Amino acid sequence: LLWCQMKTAGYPNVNVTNFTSSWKDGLAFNALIHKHRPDLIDFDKLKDSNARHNLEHAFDVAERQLGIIQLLDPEDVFTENPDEKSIITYVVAFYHYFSKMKVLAVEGKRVGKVIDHAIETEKMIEKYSGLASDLLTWIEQTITVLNSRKFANSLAGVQQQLQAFSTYRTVEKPPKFQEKGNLEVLLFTIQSRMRANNQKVYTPHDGKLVSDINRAWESLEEAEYRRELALRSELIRQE
């Protein structure tokens, strides 16, 4: 009663002091369902002299629009004999209903923010997994090509693979080292994402690690490098 009196005294034109005679005009139910949801009822064009209407308006938007069902009449309140248990059931009903749906909306936005942030992280988690798999397969099928250390015997030929290897140096190495930097950027993005989200460790699976990429990448550097040694050894002999 203190809740409804305090909330309806601030609301215009309705004064509620009891549970029997302050409710006969029907404006108080409509005011309390209008504060939490103004969008359904035009409270301003209602008058107390149409009191039997005023309940059956608000009573008609009570069950179907909101989901609270109980069987009375406008005449039952309109009679001088009051029903205390009916109005007690109604007041506890919309109190629990409005508190429930208020905390429902608040908790809904709370959970939605975090889970949207999370799923936005894991789509590009699968993107990172796919790019890492593609890049490491490319790495290990290119080192196999670069193992080949047998070719013909000619000054023009040795100079021609020198030119081809220099073009493979100066055109192809910058982008095929650039995907490693892009992968590192994505991994730090995931790190910053998780401690923004504050969950446990992602723990990228075995066979897909930065240490494995580094191991393969100095491995291809070494294979390149005692490719280069043998190249100019035979070059200077032929020269």
Binding site: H96, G108, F188, R232
Partner: protein, 229 residues
């Protein structure tokens, strides 16, 4: 400890890069003559470290921008001016004496005016929701709540940014209405079915204290302690 100091560290990195892009010139221009000095070999490629320097520049800029993005995550309440004005009006209405401190009964009446599901005045019974709220507001049992004491609870209860996972812990309990298990239907009045499908895929089945398993019983405690713990 605080995220403002990291700015300075990033700024210190921003103090390095221009000087060292200075330094990059005195490498690369030098390379310009040694490659015109009739090739030869240096065990080394300068252009590659040019891309690693550019990569360090880009990661530093992105890390800085993501760090102001984070400090905007943690320092934006998102509460509208209308909600704050309503909270101030409720604080003024509950404190009719204008003493700047509302009593425990006044705080309970204001919480009832804030549409909190708190049953009151049971016949010789004690409930723990009001006690927990009083402990969160005034843990010292001072008997009065100031303007800021209730405002901290309102800000932590209102919207948007989250300090700790404990509120998620005991807020899926409130979403489950105090039940140790939750259902998909309860989750589907608040959350998009996209995220509901995610939650049903990644969170397991609940076991009660009796040990019996519901087919529809879902435990948020184990899921939260598994991902966020």
């Amino acid at each position: 400890g605080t995220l403002e100091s990291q700015l300075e560290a990033n700024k210190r990195k921003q103090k390095e890069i221009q000087a060292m892009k200075r330094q990059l010139t005195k490498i690369e221009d030098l390379g310009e003559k040694l490659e015109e000095a009739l090739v030869l070999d240096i065990k080394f490629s300068t252009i590659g470290l040019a891309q690693q320097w550019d990569q360090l520049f880009q990661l530093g800029v992105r890390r800085q921008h993501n760090l102001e993005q984070q400090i905007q995550i943690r320092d934006t309440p998102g509460v509208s001016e209308e909600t704050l004005e309503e909270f101030k009006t409720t604080y003024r209405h509950f404190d009719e004496n204008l003493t700047g401190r509302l009593s425990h009964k006044d705080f309970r009446s204001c919480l009832r005016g804030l549409n909190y599901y708190l049953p009151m005045v049971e016949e010789g019974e004690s409930e723990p929701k009001f006690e927990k709220f009083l402990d969160a507001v005034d843990p010292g049992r001072k008997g009065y709540v100031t303007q800021e004491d209730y405002t901290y609870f309102l800000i932590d209860k209102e919207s948007e940014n989250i300090k700790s996972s404990d509120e998620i812990e005991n807020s899926f309990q409130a979403l489950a209405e105090g039940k140790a298990y939750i259902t998909k239907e309860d989750m589907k009045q608040a959350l998009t079915p996209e995220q509901v499908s995610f939650c049903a895929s990644h969170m397991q089945q609940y076991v009660d204290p009796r040990g019996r398993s519901h087919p529809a019983g879902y435990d948020y405690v184990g899921f939260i302690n598994s991902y966020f713990g």
